[PDB]
DNA sequence: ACGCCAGACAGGG
RNA sequence: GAGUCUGCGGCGCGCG
DNA sequence: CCCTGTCTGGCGTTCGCGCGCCG
C-alpha cells in the first residue's frame, strides 16, 4: 500500500513529548537523579530548605539550629510488577542528612532518618499507588500579582486587588467610597489604605501630591488625619485592628510575614511575579515580594503602585487597565510536581510543628534522632494526597491514546482552595489564549464540563505554568524557521498571522493577509506581520488531531469524535484507519504501546515472550513482552512481535506492536467498506447495521481479562479454610477445581462454576435445632461448615488463565488483618462483535448494531464484493459533519487503488484532487471489467436512466463515460442482494474507518427478580451477583399516577420494594400461583415515622373517628 | 392492540372503572376455581404449545373476553358485599 | 457561586 | 424443614 | 410611632447507570 500526504505547510518543529509535562515536572520536582551539587534546587530540595533551618530561640532554653545537608533517595523497596501483583505502593525511600546545633559545645549529626516513602513515576508518565496505575492531572488558577478590576454592583469606579499565594498570607483590596470613607481589606474589615502607607513611611502630604497630582481620589486617603499624624504608632494601631486580643508590643514580628519570607512567594526572584508587575502595574520590586527586615523599617514598592493604578484605572487612559482573566497570560497551570511539593511542604510544617514541642521535651543534648523527628505526619500527608486527593483517578487506557489524553486534560477543580464547582461561567468558557495551550473540544460533555480540557498539540509548559504556544518569527516580509514559545501575555503585544498565508519561502505572498492582534481578527499588511502561527495542529489537542477532515465537521460533533477515541477497545486484529491525520505513529510511540529498537542491529531470538536483539555495538538485549496483562480497565495488553529471526533493524523500529497497533500505527477499530444508504429499519436515525462477514474474519473482536479475588478470613467461629471440599452436593462441579482448592489453569469456567473453594462456619454463635434433626436423619456426621465458595457471578466467565495464592508464610506481601490467605483467579474470554455493541467513526456518527445480516443478501457491488456496513443517510443532514462523507469518497479510491493517504487538518486533500484519484480508481474498477470480458448490465443501464433523469450524469454520453462521471461523484451502482435488482439511483460507498467502543458493565444488562435489601432503608439493592433493582423516580410515579394505574403504583411502593411482610408473602403467593395478599405498611413509612419520632415530633396514624390505628403491628406497645 | 378495547371502553361509564371490573373478575376467576366462566364450549380462550389455554394461562385475558360478551354484570352495588363470596364457594368446585 | 423568597431592623417624616 | 452476612459517605471519570 | 427601603438570612440547583478507590 502507498501513502500520499496532501497539505503542505512546513511543519517547523516536532510535537513535544506528549508526556513531557508529567515527566519533566516530576524530574525537576525531585532532582534526586543528580547529586545535591547540581544547581536545580526547586521542588523537594526547595521545600526542604524552606522549612529546614528551624530557629527556636528563647522560652526557657533554646538556640536550636537544625540544618539540611543533602537529600538522597535511591533504593526502591520492591519493583513495579511486584507492586501490582501484591497490593503495593511503588515508592522510593528518602533520607537526607541532618545535624542539630547547640548553644553549648556540641553538634550531633544523625545522618539518616527514613521519613516518608514518596511514589515514583513510570517511564511512560503514570504511577502505581496501590495495585492500580494512577495519574496526576494538572490544574489552573489565577497566578500571584496585583490587578484592578471594575466595581461589583455600582457602575461608578473600580477597586484594586493584591494577590499573595500561599493561602496563608493576606488578600488586599483598595476601594474608595468618598462620603467619608476609604477601604483597604486584609482579611475582611476595612481600615484605611493609608493607615498602612503611613506605617511604611508614606505621609499624607507627599503621598497625595505625587499619586494624586493627576487624580482626585487622593481626598479619601488624607481623610482620617487623626491616625495619620503618628508613624510607628500606626504599626501598633493596625495590630490592634486585627482581632484576638494580642500584646500591643511586637517590634516587627507580624510585619515580617507580609513582608519577606513565607506568605508572599519564593517564586524565583525576577520573572515569577515581577513579570506581572513591570508590564501590568508599578515599576520595581525590592526583594522577591514586598520584602525587608534590615532596619525594622519596611519598604513596599508594591502597596502604593496597586492603588496608583486604581487611581489610574478609575480616572483615564494611562493605558486601558481591564484585565481579561482568561487571557492565559494570567491564569496559571499547576503541574504534578507543584501539587506534590505543596503537600510535601504541608507535611513538613506538620512535622516541624511536633518537633518544636520536643525541643523542650528532650532532657539534655542527646535529642537529634528520635527526639526531633516523627515520620507520622509526613507519611499520612503525602499518602493522603496520592490516595484520597479528589484529583487522582483510573488511567483511561482504552488505547494508549486514551491515557495520554487523560494525562494532559486541564482542570480547575482541585485542592478545593482554588476553584469550587457551582462557581465559574467565566472560567468554563474557552478563553482566547487557550490557543495551543488547552483543547477547546477535549472538554467532556456532562455536568463536569469546561473545567476539564486536554492541552493542544505543540503546547508545552515552559518554566512556570504558562502554556506557551509555538509561534515563528517573521522579520519584515520574511518568515523564519525559528520559533518562540510565547507567554500568553507577550502574545498580545504582537501582530501574529495564520499559517494559511501564501508563502514562497521567507516571503509573504499577499498584501492583504490575515493576522490577529489581540483576540481580534485583523487584516494586516505583510510589513506589519511580526509573527506567524506554527501550524494548524497546535490549535487543537492530540486526541483531536486524530480526526481526518476535522475542517468539515461541526466543532460540537467533533468533540464526540475525540471522546469516542478515548473509549476505543483493543481489537485482536488492529487496523490503522484507511485515512489518517498524521499523529497515529506519534501516539503509539510517545505513548509506550509498541517496543522500539534502541540501536541498529540484527535479531537473534523471536519468541512469543521475548525478542533478543543483537546490536552492532557487540551487545545483545533480551526484550520481554508483556504477554497478557490486566489493564486497570480490564483490557488486554500484549506486545505482538512483528520482526522475524535474524533481521537488521533500523534505530527506532517497531520490534513488537503495542496493545492496539497494526504496524507502528495507532489502531482502534478497522477500515471497512461501507454503503451509505437506508435499509428497512435496521439502521435507524442513530442506529446502524453490520455484515456477518465481518465476524467471519475476526474483524471486530477484542480481549477482556478479569481479576476475581477471594480471601480466607479468620472468624472467631473458626478459620475459613481453602480446600477442594465443597460440603454439600457434587463432584461434577469439582473437576475444574483440580489442584486442592485452586482451579486448574486453562479451564473453561462458565457462569456459576467454582473458581475457588472456601469453608466458613454456619451460624453467628449457635448451631441450629431444626437443622440438627435434618443432619441426623440422613447422616448426623455432616461437616457443620457452610458452603461459602467464590462462584462465577451471573453474567459470564471464560477460561482460567492465571491463579495466585498467598498462604501462611508470606514472602514479602501485605496480608490484611483477619485475612488468613487470599486467592486471585484471572479469567479471560473472547468477545465477538454483536448486536448490543456500539461503534463510531472519528467524525461523530455514533451508533449501535441493530442487525447482523448474512452476506447472502446485503447490498453487493456489480462485482461480487459485498458491503460491510450500511450507514443511515438521515443521520448526517441535521448533524453537520460532511467530513465523513469525504472520508468515504477518498476511501473508495484507496480500495481499488490499493493505497492509504494522509489528509492534514485544514491543509489536506481537496475535492478536485479526490475526484482525480477516483478517476484512477475507475480504471482499476471498470478497466479490469472491460478486459475480463464483460460490459454493462440491464441493471447498470436502468439505474443510469433514472440517474440522468435525476441530474447526476450529462444526458447523451456513453454508459462507459457516464458511469465514470457517476463514480467521480463518489457513488456506484449496487444491487439489492436480496432480489438481485439494483438500487434505483447511485449510492456512494467507500472505505470508512470505524471503531468499537468500550463495553462497560453498563452494557452487560441487569434483570432482578428477588435479592438483597438495604440495612437501614428496606429498599432492594444488589452489587456482586444480585443485579439490584431499578429506580422508579417521582417522574415515573407521576406517569402511573396519570394513568389509573392504582395498584400498579401501590405494588411499586409496597410489594416490590419496601413492604417487608408484603414482599415475603408476595413471593410465596406467586410460588403457589395464588393471588398476592393485601399490602402491609411500607418499612419506609415506618422508618420515617420513627426518624420523625427521633425528633420531638410525634406522628400518629388515626381511625375513622380521630382515634389510633397501628402501623407498627405490635412492637410499639411496651414490654 | 387488545381485543375490542374500544367496545369495552364504551361498555363502561369511566375508563378506570373497566379496569377495576376486569381485574376483580380475573381475581374471582382464579380464587373460587378457574372454571368460574360463562362461555367455555365452542370458541373460547386458547394457547398453542398444545391447546392448553383452556385451563389456566392468563386470568384477565378471559375476564375481558367475557365482559366483551353481554353475560356479566358490573355495578356499584349489585349484590351485598359478604353474601356473594358465600354463594360463590357453594356453587363453584375446583379449590 | 447565583437566584429567589421572606424578613427583620433602621432611617426620614 | 436452608438463610446469614456483606456492599456506607464522599470523591474522580464515562453514557444518553 | 408609621411606611419605605436595604441589607440580611435561609434553600435549591435533572435523572438513572458503570467502574474504581478509600477509612
Ligand atoms: N445533561 C443531560 N441531562 C439529561 N439528559 C441528557 C443530557 N444530555 C443528554 N441527555 C438526554 O439524552 C438524549 C441525548 O440527546 P439526543 O439523542 O441528541 C436527543 P435529540 O433531541 O433527539 O437530538 P437529535 O435529534 O440530534 O437526535 C436527550 O434526549 C436527553 O434526553
Short mmCIF file of N, CA and C in Angstrom, two decimals, chain A residues 740-831:
data_model
loop_
_atom_site.label_atom_id
_atom_site.label_comp_id
_atom_site.label_asym_id
_atom_site.label_seq_id
_atom_site.Cartn_x
_atom_site.Cartn_y
_atom_site.Cartn_z
N UNK A 740 -5.94 -29.08 44.80
CA UNK A 740 -6.66 -28.99 46.06
C UNK A 740 -6.99 -27.55 46.39
N UNK A 741 -8.24 -27.16 46.13
CA UNK A 741 -8.67 -25.81 46.42
C UNK A 741 -8.71 -24.88 45.23
N UNK A 742 -7.59 -24.75 44.52
CA UNK A 742 -7.48 -23.83 43.39
C UNK A 742 -8.06 -24.43 42.11
N UNK A 743 -8.40 -23.56 41.16
CA UNK A 743 -8.89 -24.01 39.86
C UNK A 743 -7.71 -24.19 38.91
N UNK A 744 -7.75 -25.25 38.10
CA UNK A 744 -6.64 -25.52 37.19
C UNK A 744 -6.62 -24.54 36.01
N UNK A 745 -5.40 -24.14 35.64
CA UNK A 745 -5.17 -23.20 34.55
C UNK A 745 -5.54 -23.81 33.21
N UNK A 746 -6.18 -22.99 32.39
CA UNK A 746 -6.62 -23.43 31.09
C UNK A 746 -7.97 -24.13 31.16
N UNK A 747 -8.70 -23.85 32.23
CA UNK A 747 -10.01 -24.44 32.43
C UNK A 747 -11.11 -23.46 32.08
N UNK A 748 -12.04 -23.91 31.24
CA UNK A 748 -13.18 -23.11 30.78
C UNK A 748 -14.23 -22.97 31.88
N UNK A 749 -14.28 -21.79 32.47
CA UNK A 749 -15.21 -21.53 33.54
C UNK A 749 -16.41 -20.71 33.06
N UNK A 750 -17.58 -21.32 33.17
CA UNK A 750 -18.83 -20.68 32.80
C UNK A 750 -19.48 -20.03 34.01
N UNK A 751 -20.46 -19.15 33.80
CA UNK A 751 -21.08 -18.53 34.96
C UNK A 751 -21.68 -19.56 35.91
N UNK A 752 -21.29 -19.47 37.18
CA UNK A 752 -21.81 -20.38 38.19
C UNK A 752 -20.87 -21.50 38.58
N UNK A 753 -19.64 -21.50 38.07
CA UNK A 753 -18.70 -22.56 38.43
C UNK A 753 -17.79 -22.12 39.56
N UNK A 754 -17.17 -23.08 40.24
CA UNK A 754 -16.28 -22.74 41.35
C UNK A 754 -14.89 -22.38 40.88
N UNK A 755 -14.55 -21.12 41.14
CA UNK A 755 -13.25 -20.60 40.81
C UNK A 755 -12.29 -20.91 41.93
N UNK A 756 -12.82 -20.79 43.14
CA UNK A 756 -12.09 -21.07 44.38
C UNK A 756 -13.05 -21.57 45.46
N UNK A 757 -12.66 -22.60 46.21
CA UNK A 757 -13.49 -23.14 47.27
C UNK A 757 -13.03 -22.72 48.66
N UNK A 758 -13.97 -22.34 49.51
CA UNK A 758 -13.67 -21.90 50.88
C UNK A 758 -14.74 -22.40 51.86
N UNK A 759 -14.35 -22.60 53.12
CA UNK A 759 -15.29 -23.15 54.10
C UNK A 759 -15.30 -22.34 55.41
N UNK A 760 -16.44 -21.68 55.67
CA UNK A 760 -16.65 -20.89 56.90
C UNK A 760 -17.64 -21.59 57.84
N UNK A 761 -18.02 -20.93 58.94
CA UNK A 761 -18.94 -21.56 59.88
C UNK A 761 -20.40 -21.06 59.71
N UNK A 762 -21.32 -22.01 59.89
CA UNK A 762 -22.79 -21.95 59.69
C UNK A 762 -23.50 -20.77 60.41
N UNK A 763 -23.44 -20.68 61.74
CA UNK A 763 -24.18 -19.61 62.40
C UNK A 763 -23.34 -18.47 62.95
N UNK A 764 -24.01 -17.59 63.69
CA UNK A 764 -23.35 -16.45 64.32
C UNK A 764 -22.55 -16.90 65.55
N UNK A 765 -23.17 -17.75 66.36
CA UNK A 765 -22.54 -18.27 67.58
C UNK A 765 -23.16 -19.61 68.02
N UNK A 766 -24.38 -19.89 67.56
CA UNK A 766 -25.13 -21.09 67.96
C UNK A 766 -25.44 -22.04 66.78
N UNK A 767 -25.54 -23.36 67.07
CA UNK A 767 -25.87 -24.30 65.98
C UNK A 767 -27.35 -24.12 65.56
N UNK A 768 -28.01 -25.15 65.01
CA UNK A 768 -29.43 -24.97 64.62
C UNK A 768 -30.29 -26.18 65.06
N UNK A 769 -31.30 -25.96 65.96
CA UNK A 769 -32.18 -27.04 66.45
C UNK A 769 -32.98 -27.75 65.32
N UNK A 770 -33.39 -27.00 64.29
CA UNK A 770 -34.14 -27.58 63.16
C UNK A 770 -33.19 -28.30 62.17
N UNK A 771 -32.05 -27.67 61.90
CA UNK A 771 -31.03 -28.24 61.01
C UNK A 771 -30.28 -29.39 61.69
N UNK A 772 -30.48 -29.53 63.00
CA UNK A 772 -29.85 -30.60 63.77
C UNK A 772 -30.57 -31.91 63.55
N UNK A 773 -31.90 -31.83 63.42
CA UNK A 773 -32.73 -33.01 63.16
C UNK A 773 -32.57 -33.48 61.70
N UNK A 774 -32.42 -32.54 60.76
CA UNK A 774 -32.22 -32.85 59.33
C UNK A 774 -30.88 -33.56 59.11
N UNK A 775 -29.81 -33.01 59.70
CA UNK A 775 -28.48 -33.60 59.60
C UNK A 775 -28.48 -35.06 60.11
N UNK A 776 -28.99 -35.29 61.32
CA UNK A 776 -29.04 -36.62 61.99
C UNK A 776 -29.84 -37.68 61.18
N UNK A 777 -31.00 -37.31 60.62
CA UNK A 777 -31.88 -38.24 59.88
C UNK A 777 -31.14 -38.97 58.72
N UNK A 778 -30.50 -38.22 57.83
CA UNK A 778 -29.80 -38.82 56.69
C UNK A 778 -28.31 -39.17 57.03
N UNK A 779 -27.70 -38.43 57.96
CA UNK A 779 -26.32 -38.67 58.36
C UNK A 779 -25.80 -37.53 59.23
N UNK A 780 -26.05 -37.63 60.54
CA UNK A 780 -25.67 -36.62 61.54
C UNK A 780 -24.25 -36.06 61.30
N UNK A 781 -23.31 -36.97 61.06
CA UNK A 781 -21.92 -36.61 60.80
C UNK A 781 -21.79 -35.86 59.48
N UNK A 782 -22.15 -34.59 59.52
CA UNK A 782 -22.06 -33.74 58.36
C UNK A 782 -21.20 -32.54 58.66
N UNK A 783 -20.20 -32.27 57.82
CA UNK A 783 -19.30 -31.13 58.01
C UNK A 783 -20.12 -29.86 58.28
N UNK A 784 -20.30 -29.59 59.58
CA UNK A 784 -21.06 -28.47 60.15
C UNK A 784 -20.84 -27.19 59.34
N UNK A 785 -19.70 -27.11 58.67
CA UNK A 785 -19.29 -25.97 57.86
C UNK A 785 -20.27 -25.69 56.71
N UNK A 786 -20.40 -24.41 56.40
CA UNK A 786 -21.27 -23.98 55.34
C UNK A 786 -20.49 -23.76 54.07
N UNK A 787 -21.19 -23.84 52.95
CA UNK A 787 -20.55 -23.61 51.67
C UNK A 787 -20.55 -22.13 51.31
N UNK A 788 -19.38 -21.51 51.44
CA UNK A 788 -19.15 -20.11 51.08
C UNK A 788 -18.03 -20.05 50.08
N UNK A 789 -18.36 -20.42 48.86
CA UNK A 789 -17.36 -20.51 47.85
C UNK A 789 -17.55 -19.49 46.77
N UNK A 790 -16.43 -18.96 46.31
CA UNK A 790 -16.45 -18.00 45.23
C UNK A 790 -16.98 -18.67 43.95
N UNK A 791 -18.13 -18.22 43.47
CA UNK A 791 -18.73 -18.79 42.26
C UNK A 791 -18.74 -17.78 41.13
N UNK A 792 -18.86 -18.26 39.89
CA UNK A 792 -18.90 -17.31 38.80
C UNK A 792 -20.21 -16.53 38.83
N UNK A 793 -20.14 -15.23 39.11
CA UNK A 793 -21.35 -14.42 39.18
C UNK A 793 -22.11 -14.43 37.87
N UNK A 794 -23.45 -14.30 37.91
CA UNK A 794 -24.12 -14.28 36.64
C UNK A 794 -23.52 -13.22 35.75
N UNK A 795 -23.67 -13.45 34.47
CA UNK A 795 -23.02 -12.62 33.51
C UNK A 795 -22.12 -13.61 32.84
N UNK A 796 -20.80 -13.47 32.90
CA UNK A 796 -20.03 -14.51 32.25
C UNK A 796 -18.64 -14.66 32.83
N UNK A 797 -18.07 -15.76 32.37
CA UNK A 797 -16.73 -16.18 32.68
C UNK A 797 -16.15 -16.73 31.39
N UNK A 798 -14.86 -16.98 31.39
CA UNK A 798 -14.23 -17.53 30.21
C UNK A 798 -13.37 -18.68 30.61
N UNK A 799 -12.10 -18.66 30.25
CA UNK A 799 -11.22 -19.73 30.67
C UNK A 799 -10.25 -19.21 31.71
N UNK A 800 -9.93 -20.03 32.69
CA UNK A 800 -9.00 -19.62 33.71
C UNK A 800 -7.61 -19.58 33.15
N UNK A 801 -6.97 -18.42 33.22
CA UNK A 801 -5.65 -18.32 32.65
C UNK A 801 -4.57 -18.30 33.73
N UNK A 802 -4.82 -17.59 34.82
CA UNK A 802 -3.82 -17.48 35.86
C UNK A 802 -4.46 -17.57 37.22
N UNK A 803 -3.70 -18.05 38.19
CA UNK A 803 -4.18 -18.16 39.55
C UNK A 803 -3.09 -17.74 40.54
N UNK A 804 -3.45 -17.01 41.59
CA UNK A 804 -2.49 -16.57 42.61
C UNK A 804 -2.96 -16.94 44.01
N UNK A 805 -2.08 -17.54 44.80
CA UNK A 805 -2.43 -17.94 46.15
C UNK A 805 -1.32 -17.55 47.14
N UNK A 806 -1.72 -16.87 48.21
CA UNK A 806 -0.81 -16.42 49.26
C UNK A 806 -1.16 -17.07 50.59
N UNK A 807 -0.36 -18.07 50.99
CA UNK A 807 -0.61 -18.80 52.22
C UNK A 807 0.14 -18.19 53.40
N UNK A 808 0.12 -18.96 54.48
CA UNK A 808 0.68 -18.69 55.79
C UNK A 808 2.01 -17.90 55.75
N UNK A 809 3.13 -18.55 55.42
CA UNK A 809 4.43 -17.87 55.43
C UNK A 809 4.65 -16.89 54.28
N UNK A 810 4.05 -15.70 54.36
CA UNK A 810 4.11 -14.67 53.33
C UNK A 810 5.55 -14.18 53.04
N UNK A 811 5.96 -14.18 51.74
CA UNK A 811 7.26 -13.79 51.15
C UNK A 811 7.66 -12.36 51.47
N UNK A 812 6.83 -11.44 51.00
CA UNK A 812 7.05 -10.02 51.21
C UNK A 812 5.77 -9.29 50.88
N UNK A 813 4.68 -9.99 51.16
CA UNK A 813 3.36 -9.47 50.89
C UNK A 813 2.72 -8.88 52.14
N UNK A 814 1.71 -8.06 51.90
CA UNK A 814 0.96 -7.42 52.94
C UNK A 814 -0.46 -7.99 53.00
N UNK A 815 -0.59 -9.03 53.81
CA UNK A 815 -1.86 -9.70 54.08
C UNK A 815 -2.66 -8.90 55.11
N UNK A 816 -3.89 -8.51 54.80
CA UNK A 816 -4.66 -7.70 55.74
C UNK A 816 -4.95 -8.47 57.04
N UNK A 817 -5.31 -7.75 58.13
CA UNK A 817 -5.60 -8.46 59.38
C UNK A 817 -6.86 -9.35 59.25
N UNK A 818 -6.90 -10.44 60.02
CA UNK A 818 -8.02 -11.34 59.94
C UNK A 818 -7.92 -12.21 58.71
N UNK A 819 -7.39 -11.62 57.64
CA UNK A 819 -7.20 -12.31 56.37
C UNK A 819 -6.12 -13.38 56.50
N UNK A 820 -6.54 -14.64 56.52
CA UNK A 820 -5.63 -15.76 56.63
C UNK A 820 -4.83 -15.92 55.36
N UNK A 821 -5.53 -15.94 54.22
CA UNK A 821 -4.88 -16.11 52.93
C UNK A 821 -5.78 -15.63 51.79
N UNK A 822 -5.21 -15.17 50.68
CA UNK A 822 -6.03 -14.69 49.57
C UNK A 822 -5.90 -15.62 48.37
N UNK A 823 -6.82 -15.50 47.41
CA UNK A 823 -6.78 -16.32 46.19
C UNK A 823 -7.36 -15.56 45.00
N UNK A 824 -6.47 -15.15 44.10
CA UNK A 824 -6.88 -14.46 42.90
C UNK A 824 -7.14 -15.45 41.76
N UNK A 825 -8.13 -15.17 40.91
CA UNK A 825 -8.47 -16.06 39.78
C UNK A 825 -8.75 -15.26 38.50
N UNK A 826 -7.73 -15.10 37.66
CA UNK A 826 -7.87 -14.36 36.41
C UNK A 826 -8.60 -15.18 35.36
N UNK A 827 -9.68 -14.61 34.83
CA UNK A 827 -10.44 -15.30 33.80
C UNK A 827 -10.56 -14.44 32.56
N UNK A 828 -10.29 -15.06 31.42
CA UNK A 828 -10.34 -14.35 30.16
C UNK A 828 -11.40 -14.92 29.24
N UNK A 829 -11.87 -14.11 28.30
CA UNK A 829 -12.93 -14.53 27.39
C UNK A 829 -12.87 -13.77 26.07
N UNK A 830 -13.15 -14.44 24.96
CA UNK A 830 -13.15 -13.77 23.65
C UNK A 830 -14.51 -13.14 23.36
N UNK A 831 -14.54 -11.84 23.08
CA UNK A 831 -15.81 -11.15 22.81
C UNK A 831 -15.96 -10.88 21.31
#
